[PDB]
Amino acid sequence: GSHSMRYFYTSVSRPGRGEPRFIAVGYVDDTQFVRFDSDAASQRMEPRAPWIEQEGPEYWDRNTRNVKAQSQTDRVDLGTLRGYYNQSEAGSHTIQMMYGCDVGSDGRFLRGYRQDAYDGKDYIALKEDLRSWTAADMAAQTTKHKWEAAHVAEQWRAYLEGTCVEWLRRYLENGKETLQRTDAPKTHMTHHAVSDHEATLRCWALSFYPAEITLTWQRDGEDQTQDTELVETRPAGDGTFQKWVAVVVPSGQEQRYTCHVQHEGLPKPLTLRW
Amino acid sequence: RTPKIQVYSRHPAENGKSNFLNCYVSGFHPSDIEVDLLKNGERIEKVEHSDLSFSKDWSFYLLYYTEFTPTEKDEYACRVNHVTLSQPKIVKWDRDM
Amino acid sequence: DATALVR
Ligand SMILES: [Mg+2]
Ligand SMILES: [Mg+2]
Ligand SMILES: [Mg+2]
């Protein structure tokens, strides 16, 4: 259906020696497709999906210059922000930034975003209108006043509504074999006695894509929230995801409980029973 | 902002069959973190990890992984240290989770 | 395709 492209940048200062560590990752939906790591040997933006490997040498040169430029801007900003927050030169600090766009089923622009954080707290974010800034505190307010005067939001709006969506459309086309394919969860239930009179039922969803899923238990056709445990969705390490939900039940009453699985890859929600 | 930890196998475990042991660390800040995979209390050498990324609330996540063969006797675990933790946190691998 | 002023 709808799709997204997102870049995640992290800069971490190294007060003991040298320049900050800079890491950049790009995603299309739940698929990582590019990376840059200032500690890696290449000093280049690298491919991480087969469908991007086809891009010309100019694509790789431009992407490399862009992330190396941001890494230097982040290094300057770490110094500026240390001053804003009246911090010492001895501690390690972090700047993170995420930006991207969402397109609908027809490829049209839906939403754009560009937000950043200092030491894991919101600093400055482009509002949904892509015209103005939300500053979380007085240090971010100093940045907002400088950026309001310098057409910064206009440049982000032009990129998010243009370049961002055009490249996302190309990636979705080139990587359609995987990016536009859903992997339905492979589901199964396991049984684990907790005593001679109680047992845990655990409903598994494996090897699915995209990561969004809903796993719920019902007892006699109504939602069961008591005695349940739902783990956070986790990566399998092969590009797919995993999740399980469990409930403790009295032995002999297992048939009252049904697990319900909702995923984009399933035309109709799935129902499992022990 | 302490790390949340899940230790699990890529594939449903079968004793004697090659698989991948995963340690998913998430919800933590700052990004500096020590993650080791253990076999019978000892650090496994050939451990790789994912490229640093983060969630909406800015908390970081990483996947550490290595190939392994589950068996009847071998005990596997993940050992995590981070600035928010007083001592290293050890989470044992249980094939049922 | 990746893409900015100083803070
Ligand atoms: Mg049965
Ligand atoms: Mg998130
Ligand atoms: Mg064995």
Author numbering:
A (entry chain A): 1 to 274
B (entry chain B): 3 to 99
C (entry chain C): 1 to 3, 9 to 12
What text does the study give?
Conversely, two independent studies associated the HLA-A*68:01 allele, which is expressed at 5.2–25% allele frequency, with severe influenza disease during the 2009 influenza pandemic. To understand CD8+ T cell responses in the context of the high risk HLA-A*68:01 molecule, we have recently identified a novel extended 12 amino acid influenza-derived peptide from the virus nucleoprotein (NP145–156; DATYQRTRALVR) with the capacity to bind to HLA-A*68:0118. Here, we provide an in-depth analysis of influenza virus-specific CD8+ T cells directed against the extended 12 aa NP145 peptide restricted by the risk HLA-A*68:01 molecule.
To understand whether presentation of this extended NP145 peptide (hereafter NP145) within HLA-A*68:01 was associated with any structural constraints, which potentially could affect TCR recognition of the A68/NP145 epitope, we solved the structure of the HLA-A*68:01-NP145 complex at a resolution of 1.90 Å. The structure showed that the anchor residue Ala at P2 was bound within the HLA-A*68:01 peptide-binding groove, despite being smaller than the usual P2 anchor residues for HLA-A*68:01 (Val or Thr). The C-terminal part of the NP145 peptide possessed a canonical HLA-A*68:01 anchor residue Arg at P12, which formed a network of salt bridges with Asp77, Asp74, and Asp114 within the HLA-A*68:01 molecule. In contrast, the central section (residues P4–P9) of the NP145 peptide presented weak/no electron density associated with a high degree of peptide mobility, despite the well-defined electron density of the N- and C-terminal ends of the NP145 peptide. The flexible nature of the NP145 peptide might potentially present a challenge for TCR engagement, thereby limiting the recruitment of A68/NP145-specific CD8+ T cells during influenza virus infection. We solved the structure of the HLA-A*68:01-NP145 with an Alanine at position 146 (P2-Ala) as this variant was present in both A/H3N2 and A/H1N1 influenza viruses that circulated in the last decade. This is in accordance with a previously solved binary structure of HLA-A*68:01 and a 9 aa NP91–99 peptide showing that the HLA-A*68:01-bound peptide was highly flexible, thus allowing the binding of overlapping peptides of different lengths but of conserved residues located at P2 and PΩ53.
